[PDB]
Design a protein around this ligand. Structure first.
Ligand SMILES: CCC/C(C)=C/C=C(\C)C(=O)[C@H]1C(=O)C=C([C@H](C)CCC/C=N/C(=O)OC)OC1=O
Ligand SMILES: [Mg+2]
Ligand SMILES: [Zn+2]
Ligand SMILES: [Zn+2]
Lengths: 57, 1119, 170, 56, 150, 112, 95, 226
């Protein structure tokens, strides 16, 4: 059961959610990275906060 | 030859301007040219008078005046034809006289703001978007008014409703489980309607008591009389109906808004639903929609009639005002003008939002003019609109009709509030009101069927977005040339006799007449009649009308014809039918295909490239003749002079035949000897055989123009270039492309040659170490430059004809960012007829060229003349498309009778008349015979004997004579060009007007083996000079499975598609002439696994021993 | 998407024999390029691969014997024709192709049955059974000339249809 | 007279009575002749063939 | 179909039918619950452990079940197929918890996978059939007397 | 060299999870724009997912296939087909546990 | 068309069985040049190219023919996994 | 020998409805609502139609081209289900051993209140062709080994036999009664139907049946009509 909870978030191989240059100086990607991003951001932020013995709120 | 017209219906008036719609809708929406900004805002200027006066006045800061004054525009930056060249959008900037004042009566008026320019409509009616000929489809909708739809759910009663049309306007609906609930639904929230009744200033008494009279059932109303005593109370309370929670301060917040603001009004000042509502609700209203000014409170002459009417309806027989939605009298059509204006408003309102966000940090008077301005928002809106509009689509100029008919179409697709792809079966239906308004028959075949239609030739739409149809007034048997356009509703009011009604002078010629009462198929003695159809034609779409003997083929197959005519392509040897309905001539004019004389004079000069003429007065107007030019669909579009020097000519006179115009008549094809009969199954199923002769006569030969492009990108890895100097091996491969980068015009190119030479740097300009060595062994100059030149895609090419080069062209080039310069090459090719092309007659009879026969074996008549095409007869019975038959029959007479005919639709020819002409012709065909010392072919006898056994001929008659009898049945005797022996049985032969159909590059002949691969899915991807792979789907999987070809299906999807390593290994294997390796896992799946894993989901491949298995064979196993 | 696939419009081949089907050389060519290539090499005409490879890159430089070989390869082999919608297995069938002129596919009249499709414009898809094994299944249980009865009713699917009957009837 | 069914039935039997492959031969045979004849058959379609019976 | 003049042998249908009957419900556990509606055949080991196989003499009363094609298949033993259709999540989620194993008895699965089809040529029954020439039937002798060293 | 006959589907042991990750993403950084470089410890840090150029490290200290699979003592990136980049998986370590929705919004909400 | 096809079926219990069979013969019959066959020159798949008759290379053709002549034997389980290749690689070196 | 006649008759092309329209009366056309019209379409196609005539007809013309679109566009919809539902089922065994079977009738009761009535051959054939006999069968002086496959003729015979009021039901091995594990044994299936012989093992029947059903679908009256 414990398994249904998370603390170890998997990540797709790069070439499956690639980042490629396209037109005259621009590129494209998958939303994931983005999703992925924001996520990471949050978690790492979090760390500090705890590391900051901050208001549990 | 001589043209012979038929039928005798006296068309009181000729047809109306066609593109007329597009042209005026727009014309009546700009008010540019002759409009002095005088007395009208009907469209854009109204769009103005609404986005104005925009204020931001706190009586404290006092005056913060900013109103409209005058709109303006007029310098098309560049010329149409030029716009197309540089992918521009023909249009003109738009200035505007405004006015900003100050509490200090500071009236500073910066009378200028041309930030935004808008597209213009061609002389023909289309538009030029980024060089692309674009078209706008006028779409229909549910006219703004009041209606009473039988409540679906409960088969007991019905729901009434209202519809003003702003983008943010009201949408009323009523219903009731009445005991108390006067179910008044608003957005998604309803309640008792009574509460509103008092806010009006009327209580249960003045209302429910005096009205709820005949409506004794007004109990479904009167439930809270106390709430009905002081307007103010119910007044406030109602706000409740809205979220979240605010104080009773805004005594008239959402009120004044639903009074005299853009919301309530359907149209401006009633016009829309006033006539509706009013004529269906007693009398007029309060001003325009609901408004009440110099009193404070609000008078509603709205719900007033409404409610009581639902009553007058939820009653016995007080008007029985049900509402047939599909009824045209209840559906409006939005046209370009209108259609665009609204879009003009959005980005417009989107600017005011902007301007209001400026009063905030706006200085005392450091704001006056356009420091408060920005087009971009509005600029985008409209721009975005056209360019990316669902109803904005490339001009279909396959030919003219094509282009023209395209304009005449009507969409039901578009507005996410006025259009829905939810298949409205009965909406796709052909409603009675369609008569003389929508082409009952013309509609795209396909899931878009019944959603896209053409306009009934004579039908016309008034500024109110309503169609109307021609009708002549009748007077007790007397027919008046006094016509009367009319709408759907008004129509139901009368009794309409069919045009074709026998007559005399004007007196009707019948004791009983054929008519329809509001779509009522009835018989009636003359006196009873009120109006008659002007001409059959008024019913159908234009091209639909182009069909001869329409009244003989089933509408369905007929549908095909129309559609097909639009897909007809311009032959070099253009030809109009040996028989026409009558429009052909009128068409070319409106289509704007050929050139006519705007006055009389002498033919001055007329070289192939241009014509000039002197007018009576003495004016020399040289007319630049658009020469060979590409069609949106690439077809050729050229006009050809038909007049000569010194030749005098009057107004309306032609000068140069458009692409598909002959003598000024539409020539969507060629007339030819078809002989209907089976020919060794080469015409098996729709299949059509052809006399090789035709080709020799370059009959079916067209000229397609194809354009290619290439880009000069200032790459990060260093810019690439267009040079004749490339890392290429050979030279013979440069023979023609020697013009310092470009290929010399007029060159016979073939798939694989270089239209243009280009070079850049690959692998991030890093030469392989492997390659390194090799290269050195023969002069290792690792030119970091990769040849990336433009080649002729496979399939076919043709010969160069023109080359245009844009180098950030200072003259007006707007190269895409990253692009240094571009290039364009145009290649032509006389696509001639060959096995495969598809042909069609105006009679939905379509089919492909199955085989080309040698004129020899080709079936011919005794006079050794071979026909040109053989038509299997089977494709008729199951088609009931006789029309063509007759067309041929007559097609045969005029053949010898060296003439052409004009048979009207639901009029024209009649078996006798035809049966007649043949007789004449029989003379030519036969008659001469003896005058040449010639009798009857022995074989001819052979047949005849048989012929009469088929009761074709009346026995005992003179052999010779019998023939005639036969001839009259349109059949003649045919000899097999192969065996010589005649054909056991007469054969109906004769002329038929046929068309060659357009070839979609998508319909091109594709064939892949291996090439590009979607960077992700890792599945066959098609390049430019490289084909794509076939979409192998479940349906095909299923089929395969059924058989049991395990391997195939496997390799099919693995090797042949998603299994990487495989294919290569595969290739190689094959190459070395070896067998094939086995299939691993398809990326698709692997990928899948990952996705799962990415979703925190272990997926485990296991064996019997239930032991995990790595599908990645390593690159998965870590540490 | 398949690799050795192709598509074109169809035409009727009264000459064709049940198990045959006309195929635009040009088109054929690509589909077998590799095999072909090999043969080439296998014959003086082609020293090595890249040779033939480039040697064909351009139609203009497409010699004669080329075709003469191409055929050779083909001998025995068959392919698959699809005309969507593929509703019943016979929506696919195999035939030993015969090289043809023009850019169009010559379909055998009898099969037009299952391949419910007429020559009013219908196009078809072609596929090449690669591995020896694929070819096998194909040439065996998928040859048009091996499925005459209907798997549903059991009746002669491939049978006289229109023009034929009439004649006979006559 | 030979027609759809008659033929059909005939075919089935063929397929049965004798192997499938030979049957094919038959088909083609049929195909062949069926065609050749139709062409020569002198069977067109004139509006006159739309024979309208009098009982109408 | 017949009413539309469509000639179709019964079989085909009958086939599709058996599947609706494919699953059945329970009333007598033995070791399972009641909602359990399962693929009928599991009974010759399970329902045959009656008084003979396991000899445990623990009966298994059940109930005949009739479900629509949608249903039936959708409830397959093979989780893949089941997921290959609408409501992919649920399917999985369940199969996950149960850590279901998908055998490759059916096609779709075996296919979507990348493995050789279960039937036709993919039917084991024949898959393996061996073949060598008579010229090789003389070859056996080698390793057949590759023991007679004088 | 052999074949399979059974597919499995079980939840993922954070262990198992970690048993896959060829590293852990700690940095959001996508790619450096000035040179388009898989940001270190970022989402494309090929140190985690692998060479972008088959058989070749980052700093390039290693190239030829003649270095079968020897990690870089410098750029810390392995040497092999860059192809593995579309197959290798990395992870993130959650400061706090987070629930997998498919066991919540799916009803019965398994867990609850 | 396809000769003996019917008869070909009449020589197996299962339709598909036959296929498999043939296939495999082809493969091997390929992997070892062609000396493997069970028939003389008189009877051999041919072709008319370059004005003449030269052995046909389409294995199936060959495979199919041989079977007809009972000069060959299949079966569910005939022999050990490698003795074939083995003994078989000796008799006809192919290569 | 008139063309048309010849055609339709030979079945080479065209049926009655089609002709009736061409040669004489197009007949009645019906309204969008669906209610048939009161006045008919007298004209034959040869005669030529009235503007009015022509118009009125069209409605069905729409619904016609309409209705079709829904299946022609796609109808696999059906098959799809079936597929998803019967793919796994395959010819796996030779004999499953099922002692039980099913018995196919040759008569129908309630056409009138329970009176009996023989079935039409087609139907019957559709039900017994290439079937495998469950139990032996003594008839018309001839017995039918139980386990014997039903050739076409055989059936007729029987058909003939029941006419001699000599039989009613028919013992035949079926799928329903087949005892195979998610597949079927060679016996409970019978003939192949693409070939008139006993089906060979490893046949993709599930899929086959599904298709056999789906395909036709595209040509069945969609919405109820009367
Ligand atoms: C839980 C979802 C499983 C799933 C559907 C995964 C799809 C993936 C990974 C793809 O990309 C696939 C895809 O799009 C399409 C296909 C082929 C063309 C069709 C197979 C269907 C067979 N059908 C039957 O045999 O029917 C009885 O296969 C894929 O793997
Ligand atoms: Mg078609
Ligand atoms: Zn390194
Ligand atoms: Zn069984």
């Amino acid at each position: 059961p414990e398994w249904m909870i998370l603390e170890a978030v998997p990540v797709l191989p790069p070439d499956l959610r690639p980042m490629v240059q396209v037109d005259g100086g621009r590129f494209a990607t998958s939303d994931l990275n983005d999703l992925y991003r924001r996520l990471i951001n949050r978690n790492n932020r979090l760390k500090k906060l705890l590391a900051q013995g901050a208001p549990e709120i | 030859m001589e043209i012979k017209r038929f039928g005798r219906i006296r068309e009181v008036i000729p047809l109306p301007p066609l593109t007329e719609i597009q042209v005026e809708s727009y014309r009546r929406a700009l008010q540019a040219d002759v409009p002095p900004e005088k007395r009208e805002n009907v469209g854009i200027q109204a769009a103005f008078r609404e986005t104005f006066p925009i204020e931001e006045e706190d009586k404290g800061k006092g005056g913060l005046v900013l109103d409209f004054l005058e709109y303006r525009l007029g310098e098309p930056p560049f010329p149409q034809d030029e716009c197309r060249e540089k992918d521009l959008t023909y249009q003109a900037p738009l200035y505007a006289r405004l006015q900003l004042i100050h509490k200090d009566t500071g009236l500073i008026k910066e009378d200028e703001v041309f930030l935004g320019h808008i597209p213009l409509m061609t002389e023909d009616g289309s538009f030029i978007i980024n060089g692309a000929d674009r078209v706008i489809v006028s779409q229909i909708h549910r006219s703004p008014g009041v209606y009473f739809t039988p409540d679906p759910a409960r088969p007991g009663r019905y729901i009434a409703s209202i519809i003003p049309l702003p983008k943010r306007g009201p949408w009323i609906d009523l219903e009731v489980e009445p005991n108390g609930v006067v179910s008044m639904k608003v957005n998604k929230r309803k309640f008792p309607l009574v509460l509103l009744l008092r806010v009006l200033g009327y209580d249960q008494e003045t209302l429910a008591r005096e009205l709820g009279a005949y409506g004794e059932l007004v109990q479904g109303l009167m439930d809270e009389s106390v709430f009905a005593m002081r307007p103010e109370e119910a007044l406030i309370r109602l706000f409740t109906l809205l979220r979240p929670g605010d104080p009773p301060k805004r005594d008239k917040a959402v009120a004044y808004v639903y009074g005299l603001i853009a919301d309530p009004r359907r149209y401006d000042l009633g016009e829309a639903g006033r006539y509706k509502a009013e004529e269906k609700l007693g009398i007029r209203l309060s001003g325009r929609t609901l408004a009440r000014f110099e009193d404070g409170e609000f008078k509603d002459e709205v719900f007033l009639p409404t409610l009581r009417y639902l009553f007058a309806l939820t009653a016995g027989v007080p008007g029985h005002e049900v509402d047939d939605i599909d009824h045209l009298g209840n559906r409006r059509i939005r046209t370009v003008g209108e259609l665009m204006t609204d879009q003009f408003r959005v980005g417009l309102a989107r600017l005011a939002r902007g301007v209001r966000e400026r009063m905030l940090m706006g200085s005392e008077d450091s704001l006056t003019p356009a420091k408060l301005v920005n087009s971009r928002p509005l600029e985008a809106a409209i721009r975005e609109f056209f360019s990316r509009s669902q109803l904005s689509q490339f001009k279909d100029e396959t030919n003219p009709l094509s282009s023209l008919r395209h304009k005449r179409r009507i969409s039901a697709l578009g507005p996410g509030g006025l259009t829905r792809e939810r298949a409205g079966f009965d909406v796709r239906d052909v409603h009675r009101t369609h008569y003389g308004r929508i082409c009952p028959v013309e509609t795209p075949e396909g899931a878009n069927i019944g959603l896209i239609t053409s306009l009934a030739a004579y039908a016309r739409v008034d500024e109110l977005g309503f169609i109307r149809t021609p009708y002549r007034r009748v007077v007790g048997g007397v027919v008046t040339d006094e016509v009367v356009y009319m709408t759907a509703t008004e129509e139901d009011r009368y009794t309409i006799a069919q045009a074709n009604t026998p007559l005399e002078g004007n007196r009707i010629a019948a004791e009983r007449v054929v008519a329809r009462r509001k779509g009522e198929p009835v018989i009636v003695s003359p006196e009873e009649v009120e109006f008659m159809d002007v001409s059959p034609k008024q019913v159908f779409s234009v091209n639909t009308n182009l069909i001869p003997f329409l009244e003989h083929d089933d509408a369905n197959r007929a549908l095909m014809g129309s559609n097909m005519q639009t897909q007809a392509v311009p032959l070099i040897r253009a030809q109009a039918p040996v028989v026409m309905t009558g429009l052909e001539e009128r068409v070319v004019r409106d289509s704007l295909a050929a050139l006519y004389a705007e006055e009389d004079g002498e033919v001055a000069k007329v070289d192939g490239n241009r014509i000039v003429v002197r007018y009576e007065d003495g004016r020399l107007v040289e007319y630049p003749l658009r020469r060979f030019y590409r069609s949106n669909q690439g077809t050729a579009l050229d006009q050809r002079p038909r007049v000569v020097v010194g030749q005098r000519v009057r107004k309306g006179d032609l000068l140069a035949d458009g692409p598909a115009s002959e003598n000024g008549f539409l020539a969507l094809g060629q007339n030819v000897l078809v002989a209907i009969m089976p020919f060794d199954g080469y015409n098996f199923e729709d299949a059509i055989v052809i006399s090789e002769e035709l080709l020799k006569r370059d009959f079916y030969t067209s000229i397609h123009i194809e354009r290619y492009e290439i880009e000069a990108r200032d790459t990060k890895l260093g810019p690439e270039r267009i040079t004749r100097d490339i890392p290429h091996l050979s030279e013979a491969a440069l023979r023609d492309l020697d013009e310092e980068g470009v290929v010399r015009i007029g060159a016979e190119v073939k798939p694989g040659d270089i239209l243009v030479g280009r070079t850049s740097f690959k692998g991030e300009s890093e030469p392989t170490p492997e390659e390194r060595l090799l290269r050195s062994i023969f002069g290792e100059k690792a030119r970091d430059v990769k040849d990336t030149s433009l080649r002729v895609p496979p399939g076919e090419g043709g010969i160069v004809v023109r080359t245009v080069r844009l180098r950030r062209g200072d003259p007006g080039v707007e190269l895409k960012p990253g692009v240094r310069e571009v290039v364009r090459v145009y290649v032509a090719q006389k696509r001639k007829l060959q096995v495969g092309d598809k042909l069609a007659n105006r009679h939905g009879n379509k089919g492909v060229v199955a085989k080309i026969l040698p004129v020899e074996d080709m079936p011919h008549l005794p006079d050794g003349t071979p026909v040109d095409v053989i038509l299997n007869p089977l494709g008729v019975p199951s088609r009931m498309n006789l029309g063509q038959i007759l067309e041929t029959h007559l097609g045969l007479a005029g053949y010898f009778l060296g003439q052409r005919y004009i048979s009207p639709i639901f009029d024209g020819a009649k078996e006798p008349e035809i049966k007649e002409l043949l007789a004449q012709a029989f003379e030519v065909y036969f008659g001469k015979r003896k005058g040449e010392g010639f009798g009857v072919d022995k074989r001819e006898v052979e047949v005849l004997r048989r012929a009469e056994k088929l009761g074709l001929v009346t026995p005992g008659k003179t052999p010779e004579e019998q023939l005639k009898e036969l001839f009259l049945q349109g059949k003649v005797v045919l000899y097999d060009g192969r065996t010589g022996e005649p054909i056991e049985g007469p054969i109906v032969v004769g002329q038929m007007f046929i068309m060659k159909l357009y070839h979609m590059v998508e319909d091109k002949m594709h064939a892949r083996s291996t090439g590009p691969y979607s960077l992700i899915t890792q599945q066959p991807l098609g390049g430019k000079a490289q084909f794509g792979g076939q979409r192998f789907g479940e349906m095909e999987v299923w089929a395969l499975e059924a058989y049991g070809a395990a391997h195939t299906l496997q390799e099919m999807l693995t090797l042949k598609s998603d299994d990487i390593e495989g294919r290569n290994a595969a290739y190689e294997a094959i190459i070395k002439g070896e067998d094939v390796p086995e299939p691993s896992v398809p990326e698709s799946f692997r990928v899948l696994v990952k996705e799962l894993q990415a979703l925190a989901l272990d997926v485990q491949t296991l064996d019997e021993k239930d032991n995990p298995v790595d599908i990645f064979e390593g690159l998965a196993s870590k540490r | 998407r398949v690799d050795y696939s192709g598509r074109s419009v169809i035409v009727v081949g009264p000459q064709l024999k049940l198990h045959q089907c006309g195929l635009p050389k040009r088109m054929a060519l690509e589909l077998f390029k590799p095999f072909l290539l090999k043969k080439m090499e296998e014959k003086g005409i082609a020293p090595n691969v890249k040779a033939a490879r480039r040697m064909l890159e351009r139609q203009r430089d497409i010699k004669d014997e080329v075709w003469d070989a191409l055929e050779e390869v083909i001998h025995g082999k068959v392919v698959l024709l699809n005309r969507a919608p593929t509703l019943h297995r016979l929506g696919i069938q195999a035939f030993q192709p015969v090289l043809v002129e023009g850019q169009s596919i010559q379909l055998h009249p009898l099969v037009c049955e299952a391949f419910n499709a007429d020559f009013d414009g219908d196009q078809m898809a072609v596929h090449v059974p690669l591995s020896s094994f694929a070819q096998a299944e194909a040439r065996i249980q998928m040859l048009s000339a091996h499925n005459l009865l209907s798997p549903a009713s059991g009746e002669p699917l491939a049978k006289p249809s229109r023009d034929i009957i009439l004649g006979l009837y006559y | 007279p030979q027609e759809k069914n008659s033929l059909k039935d005939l075919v089935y039997q063929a397929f049965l009575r004798l192997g499938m492959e030979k049957t094919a031969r038959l088909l083609d045979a049929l195909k062949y002749y069926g065609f050749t004849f139709s062409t020569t058959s002198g069977i067109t379609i004139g509006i006159d063939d739309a024979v309208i019976p009098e009982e109408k | 179909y017949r009413a539309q003049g469509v000639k179709l042998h019964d079989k085909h249908i009958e086939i599709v039918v058996r599947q609706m009957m494919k699953y059945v419900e329970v009333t007598d556990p033995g070791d399972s619950r009641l909602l359990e509606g399962q693929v009928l055949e599991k009974w010759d080991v399970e329902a045959l452990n009656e008084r003979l196989i396991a000899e445990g003499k623990t009966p298994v009363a059940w109930k005949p079940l009739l479900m629509g094609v949608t249903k039936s298949a959708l409830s397959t033993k093979s989780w893949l197929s089941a997921a290959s259709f609408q409501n992919t999540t649920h399917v999985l989620t369940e199969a996950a918890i149960a850590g279901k194993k998908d055998e490759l008895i059916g096609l779709k699965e075996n296919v979507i996978l990348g493995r050789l089809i279960p039937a036709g040529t993919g039917s084991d029954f024949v898959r393996f059939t061996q073949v060598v020439d008579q010229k090789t039937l003389k070859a056996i002798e080698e390793a057949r007397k590759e023991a007679v060293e004088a | 060299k052999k074949e399979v006959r059974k597919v499995r589907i079980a939840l993922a042991s954070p262990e198992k999870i970690r048993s896959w990750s060829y590293g852990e993403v700690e940095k959001p950084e996508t790619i450096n724009y000035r040179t388009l470089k898989p940001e270190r410890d970022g989402l494309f840090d090929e140190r985690i997912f692998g060479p972008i150029k088959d058989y070749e490290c980052a700093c390039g200290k290693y190239k030829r296939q003649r270095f079968e699979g020897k990690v870089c003592e410098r750029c810390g990136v392995e040497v092999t087909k860059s192809i593995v980049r579309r197959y290798r998986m990395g992870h993130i370590e959650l400061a706090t546990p987070a629930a997998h929705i498919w066991f919540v919004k799916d009803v019965p909400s398994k867990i609850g | 068309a396809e000769p003996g096809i019917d008869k070909l079926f009449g020589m197996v219990d299962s339709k598909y069985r036959l296929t498999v069979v043939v296939a495999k013969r082809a493969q091997q019959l390929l992997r070892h040049g062609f000396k493997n066959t069970v028939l003389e020159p008189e009877e051999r798949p041919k072709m008319q190219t370059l004005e003449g008759l030269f052995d046909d290379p389409n294995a199936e053709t060959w495979a199919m023919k041989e079977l007809l002549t009972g000069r060959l034997v299949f079966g569910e389980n005939l022999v050990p996994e490698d003795r074939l290749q083995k003994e078989m690689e000796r008799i006809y070196p192919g290569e | 020998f008139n063309p048309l006649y010849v055609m339709a008759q030979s079945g080479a092309r065209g049926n009655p409805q089609q002709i009736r329209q061409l040669c004489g009366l197009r007949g009645l056309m019906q309204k969008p609502s669906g209610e048939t019209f009161e006045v008919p379409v007298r004209s034959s196609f040869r005669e030529g139609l009235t503007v009015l005539e022509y118009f009125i007809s069209s409605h069905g013309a729409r619904k016609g081209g309409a209705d079709t679109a829904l299946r022609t566009a796609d109808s696999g919809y059906l098959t799809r289900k079936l597929v998803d539902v019967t793919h796994e089922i395959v010819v796996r065994e030779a004999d499953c051993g099922t002692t039980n079977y099913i018995s196919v009738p040759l008569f129908q009761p309630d056409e009138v209140t329970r009176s009996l009535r023989l079935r039409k051959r087609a139907d019957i054939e559709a039900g017994l062709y290439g079937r495998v006999l469950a139990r032996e069968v003594e008839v018309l002086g001839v017995r039918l080994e139980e386990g014997r496959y039903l050739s076409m003729d055989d059936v007729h015979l029987l058909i003939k036999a029941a006419e001699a009021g000599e039989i009613q039901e028919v013992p035949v091995r079926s799928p329903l009664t087949c005892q195979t594990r998610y597949g079927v044994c060679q016996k409970c299936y019978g003939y192949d139907l693409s070939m008139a012989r006993p089906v060979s093992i490893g046949e993709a029947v599930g899929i086959v049946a599904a298709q056999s059903i789906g395909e036709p679908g595209t040509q069945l009256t969609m919405r109820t009509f009367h």
